[PDB]
């Protein structure tokens, strides 16, 4: 998830 990785 980008909300986790970014």
């Amino acid at each position, epitope marked *: 998830t*980008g*909300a986790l990785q970014e």
Partner: antibody
Amino acid sequence: QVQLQQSGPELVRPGASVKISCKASGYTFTDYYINWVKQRPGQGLEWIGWIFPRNGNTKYNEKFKGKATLTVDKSSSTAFMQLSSLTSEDSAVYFCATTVSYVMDYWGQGTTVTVSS
Amino acid sequence: DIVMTQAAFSNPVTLGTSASISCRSSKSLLHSNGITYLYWYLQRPGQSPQLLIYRMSNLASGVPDRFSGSGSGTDFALRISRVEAEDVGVYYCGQMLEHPLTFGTGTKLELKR
């Protein structure tokens, strides 16, 4: 400066298992997720899962149940993905993509695993 | 699992012209934070993917200005101002909203002959 060097081309026999490497350089390896994707000539890009180098946390895509196992070697800034019990359905290219600023903004070379007897 | 549907090939594009590639997601990609997590990746023949657009409409440093990205809810589109030969390859859209991350079949950008 940021580069991901994946392992080379692999030819494996059905049944066997393969470990693909993805050595990182150019950024602090431990703080960024590394994604693994699978691309078969007749499909799109299928997401295998990711691993967080620092604490080795890991999440998989159900479809890559007990097929793929992601591991990390902090001391080589290297990540590995191991596919076990190989079948011709596993013949594909396997990328490793880290998310430095935005999701998978840095891609690996795209090794090519071929399973045949 | 969220599903992403793309066409196999884009409408033929005469060089220098303009072009757009579509992509629909089986569910809204908007997140509590207001960011729509749809991403765009291009794969030029004989190369690794490259991130082009992130969060629906943002350009990734390095990408040309003639690459824009928009969308309405579950419908998105990548637009190429003036297509250059170098822009040929297969375009994949990807939903980074929830696990598992999933992409579209990718769309091959064909040229008009």
